[PDB]
Amino acid sequence: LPGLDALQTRNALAIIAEAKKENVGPHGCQAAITTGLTESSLRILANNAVPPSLQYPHDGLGSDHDSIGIFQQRASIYKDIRCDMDAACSASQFFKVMKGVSGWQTLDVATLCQRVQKSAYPAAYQKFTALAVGVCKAGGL
């Protein structure tokens, strides 16, 4: 997919397929891809502060609080570690929260990412929104 390496691509393809399953369209796909790029560079990251995360396949390690997976979901909040460590399932968790945001379908993508993620660094998402448009287009959204 444009602008991604092969490892990022396998993760993005799983996210895109889940976006289609959940019927969230280009806009929803863009929010998930932007978020994954921003949080993990589209990598399923385990975390030694969340020991069960190490039992699932992972692309690398992260050391941000108790965040795990592509979306850096905090294990104290998103307690299903297996789900957090799966590209599609972790994306589904993102999409379900996203769909609770009134007007998500047209809300500025970087803003929407922040509504879902409650990041300390909301401006960070803006760096990846343009790339996300292209990734999602290439994937059929």
Residue numbers in the entry: 3 to 143
What do the authors say?
Muramidases are N-acetylmuramide glycanhydrolases which cleave the β-1,4-glycosidic bond between N-acetylmuramic acid (NAM) and N-acetylglucosamine (NAG) in the carbohydrate backbone of the bacterial cell-wall peptidoglycan. Here, the identification, characterization and X-ray structure of a novel fungal GH24 muramidase from Trichophaea saccata is first described, in which an SH3-like cell-wall-binding domain (CWBD) was identified by structure comparison in addition to its catalytic domain. A ‘domain-walking’ approach, searching for other sequences with a domain of unknown function appended to the CWBD, was then used to identify a group of fungal muramidases that also contain homologous SH3-like cell-wall-binding modules, the catalytic domains of which define a new GH family. The properties of some representative members of this family are described as well as X-ray structures of the independent catalytic and SH3-like domains of the Kionochaeta sp., Thermothielavioides terrestris and Penicillium virgatum enzymes.
The natural enzyme from Kionochaeta sp. lacks the CWBD and we describe its crystal structure. There is one subunit in the asymmetric unit, with two cadmiums, one with full occupancy, coordinated by His29 and His67 from the symmetry-related molecule and by four waters, and a second with an occupancy of 0.23, coordinated by His60 and five waters. There were no close sequence homologues with known X-ray structures for this enzyme. Similar to that of gp13, the Kionochaeta GH184 domain is mostly an α-helix bundle. It can be roughly divided into two subdomains, with one subdomain all α-helical and the second, residues 42–88, containing two (or four in TtGH184 described below) short β-strands and two very short α-helices with connecting loops. There are three poorly ordered ethylene glycol molecules from the cryoprotectant in the KsGH184 structure, two of which are close to the active site. A mutational study confirmed that Glu41 is essential for catalysis. Glu41 corresponds to the suggested catalytic Glu45 in gp13 and is located in the all-α subdomain at the end of helix 2.
